[PDB]
């Protein structure tokens, strides 16, 4: 209850009587969203926290053996809103909280009103006539380089995924990157990567915005496209004019837009 509000650093600004929720992606934590928070904070009420993963919650509350699938991570966030009463709300989450938001809505269907998915995908791996757009060994590759040198592969990982040449950008998303602790790191990764979305894609009710960038290291153009496809509800692709998996870093005016228009009704 209140002692999750402080371990995972709840915490709720603005004014509004609408009620989102920005849920950041893995190497970043809520600090992410502080860009486009602006935005947002005249016309919403916005709770931001960090994952238990994020490397600016205390490593000691990570259960390894809890975390091993995403269904945890859902247990925190409605854990989250029924401590902060909150009956319904908009959702906002960037990748593997794309994925955790895709979870809560199924779990809690009377809880999300909308669901905002930035840089998200069912699946990362490769199938029969299905492109997630890696491949076993890739992917193989990426774990030992994140095992042997954690450091080295973290300076190579993140301008590939700020992806368009924003230096400051990348050093944003380096600081919290870099502050992961590198078993998290990679037990997260290989909870993402043993993910697979596509079945359950259709028991979402709410209503689904799937924000593509034109390039995404991690998730290709189809995929949304896929997404938009065998999501269960109403749901409409909106497209970012730039590249990169962390628009809200490397070009937050823009997703700015995007996100206002989505959140206007629902
Ligand atoms: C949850 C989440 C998944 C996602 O893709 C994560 C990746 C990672 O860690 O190494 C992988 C890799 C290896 C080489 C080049 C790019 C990427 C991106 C892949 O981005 C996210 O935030």
Sequence with gaps: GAKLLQILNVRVVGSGERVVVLSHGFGT????????????????????????????????????????????????????????????????????????????????????????????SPRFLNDSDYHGGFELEEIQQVFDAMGANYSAWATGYAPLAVGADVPAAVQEFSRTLFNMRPDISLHVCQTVFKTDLRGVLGMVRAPCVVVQTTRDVSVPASVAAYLKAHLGGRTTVEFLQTEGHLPHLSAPSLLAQVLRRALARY
């Excluded at 600016?56 to 509350?61: C, G, I, L, M």
Aim: glycine share 4%.
């Design 29 to 120: 934590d809520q600090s992410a969203w502080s860009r486009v928070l602006p935005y947002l904070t005249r016309d919403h009420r916005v709770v931001l926290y960090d994952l238990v993963c994020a490397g600016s919650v205390n490593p000691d509350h990570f259960d390894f053996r809890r975390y091993d699938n995403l269904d945890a991570y859902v247990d925190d966030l409605l854990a989250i809103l029924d401590a902060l009463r909150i009956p319904r709300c908009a959702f906002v989450g960037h990748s593997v909280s794309a994925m955790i938001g895709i979870l809560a809505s199924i779990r809690r269907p009377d809880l999300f009103a909308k669901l905002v998915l930035i840089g998200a």
